[PDB]
């Protein structure tokens, strides 16, 4: 087995991983991934964060990151003993594509090349229009200034105490709510924390 | 002058016939990023 403290997983900081014959143990709250739950391996150098990209049947995708280029000859050395699976997305970059609703993901396949697969665990709210325009608004759990990094807010596609009616200048009319240790300003303009 | 005036009448009359046939249809106006993973 191998132990590394520089493995990055999940808009957060890095974590730790532990290899085993029975499964994989990922600790940020320990999590166990069994060997009978993995379906496919999509480890490749065409995308950023060159590491293993495993698919699991437990409504989650193991998008582990933080591995060197010399680890592909090592980690697959742990795969030929039991899994014996060889690891082989989209690079065209054109606007043409097809949206497919999977069991837990949203496949964006641009003529047989899948590009996006977003799980439903990080989804917060969804809205639709009369012109079949779908907008998914999320809320990334930002913890600190350093560990948050870049974070997504909304994705659009085409197919305690709270207050109401509050006028603000820094200008418009919106609403504000007080959380346990934060305040959320919501309205037609934007959402602020 | 009378000949060319009668000619202008005849050409307007045949202008009607040559214009009529061609609009017999409807004539409705209304109805890369990368090539390899090495990059």
């Amino acid at each position: 087995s191998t132990d590394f403290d520089r493995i990055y997983l999940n808009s957060k900081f890095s974590g730790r991983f532990r290899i085993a014959d029975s499964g994989l143990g990922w600790k940020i709250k320990p999590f166990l991934l069994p060997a009978t739950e993995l379906s496919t391996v999509q480890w490749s150098r065409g995308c950023r964060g060159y590491d293993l990209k495993i698919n699991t049947k437990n409504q989650g995708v193991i998008q582990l990151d933080g591995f060197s280029q010399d680890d592909y000859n090592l980690i697959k050395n742990d795969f030929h003993r039991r899994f014996n699976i060889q690891v082989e997305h989209s690079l065209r970059g054109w606007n043409w594509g097809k949206t497919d609703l999977a069991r837990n993901e949203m496949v964006f396949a641009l003529n047989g090349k899948p590009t996006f697969e977003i799980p439903y665990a990080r989804i917060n709210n969804t809205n639709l229009t009369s012109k079949n325009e779908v907008g998914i608004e999320f809320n990334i759990q930002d913890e600190e200034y350093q560990p948050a990094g870049d974070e997504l807010v909304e994705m659009r596609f085409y197919i305690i105490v709270s207050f109401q009616d509050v006028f603000f200048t820094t200008r418009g009319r919106y609403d504000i709510d007080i959380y346990k240790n934060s305040i959320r300003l919501r309205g037609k303009t934007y959402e602020y924390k | 002058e009378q000949i060319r005036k009668e000619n202008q009448k005849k050409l307007h009359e045949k202008l009607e016939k040559n214009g009529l046939l061609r609009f017999s249809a409807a004539d409705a106006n209304g109805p890369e990023s990368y090539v390899r993973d090495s990059q």
Side-chain angles (χ1 to χ4, degrees), chain A residues 15 20 23 25 30 34-35 46 49 60 66 93 97 102 109 112 114 119 121 135 147-149 172 187, chain B residues 1-31:
Chain B
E1 274 140 31
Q2 196 165 1
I3 280 171
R4 58 194 271 262
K5 201 152 189 166
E6 174 42 34
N7 279 134
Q8 291 333 285
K9 308 201 153 173
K10 283 187 290 186
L11 280 71
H12 290 113
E13 287 160 358
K14 68 188 70 154
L15 186 150
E16 215 285 326
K17 325 288 170 48
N18 296 115
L20 180 59
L21 271 297
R22 62 186 178 181
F23 314 94
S24 80
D27 291 331
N29 173 235

